[PDB]
Amino acid sequence: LFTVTAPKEVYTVDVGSSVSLECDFDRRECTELEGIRASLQKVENDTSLQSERATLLEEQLPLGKALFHIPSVQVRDSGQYRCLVICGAAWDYKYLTVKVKASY
């Protein structure tokens, strides 16, 4: 019954600038008893691994947001990601899309 939602699902960014991506989760299904972990994974095929480019702004977690930051966006950062939250045994994810504007 733990679930993740993505009220913001599409994000826009200019090459050279940073992008933030986020998904929200149901906190009354997460305590510090079983731990909380969040990850962003770029979709490159059927299996995803942790993004090398993104980091987690973990100060947002107690507010029920998994907020990710990718600095210095390049064209190859375009496309779909899975925003994943794990609370003890329970997990869920949402797809997020990054749209990039490249200039010169």
Binding site: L1, F2, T3, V4, A6, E9, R37, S39, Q41, D46, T47, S48, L49, Q50, R82, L84, I86, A89, A90, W91, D92, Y93, K94, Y95
Partner: protein, 112 residues
């Protein structure tokens, strides 16, 4: 990798619907979710399998039942409703030695 079959399933309303989620080269620690795609193509969680227990997000018609001596799982919708029609998939997560998500291809359910 994960597969999910049959690719297309059509049943009469009230009948059960069964998909099979099949996991290849996976470890003993199985954490498997059953998701449905929204009209916007976003994933929505239907049920979760972990330990050796299936739990539904909210509808107990959705059950994940491990098959005999296999890393194969029936994803059963008991007593289908027409508005169950749509695309479904399964996804699995491993936490060790590295975090990874694997998704199956979609499979389409039509309830008439």
């Amino acid at each position: 990798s994960l597969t999910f079959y049959p690719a297309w399933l059509t049943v009469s309303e009230g009948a059960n619907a069964t998909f099979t989620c099949s996991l290849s080269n996976w470890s003993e620690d199985l954490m498997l979710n059953w998701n449905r795609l929204s009209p916007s193509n976003q994933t929505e969680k239907q049920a979760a399998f972990s330990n050796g227990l299936s739990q539904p997000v909210q509808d107990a018609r959705f059950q994940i039942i491990q098959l005999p001596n296999r890393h194969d799982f029936h994803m059963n919708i008991l007593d289908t409703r027409r508005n169950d029609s749509g695309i479904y998939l399964c996804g699995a997560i491993s936490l060790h030695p590295k975090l990874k998500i694997e998704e199956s291809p979609g499979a389409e359910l039509v309830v008439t």
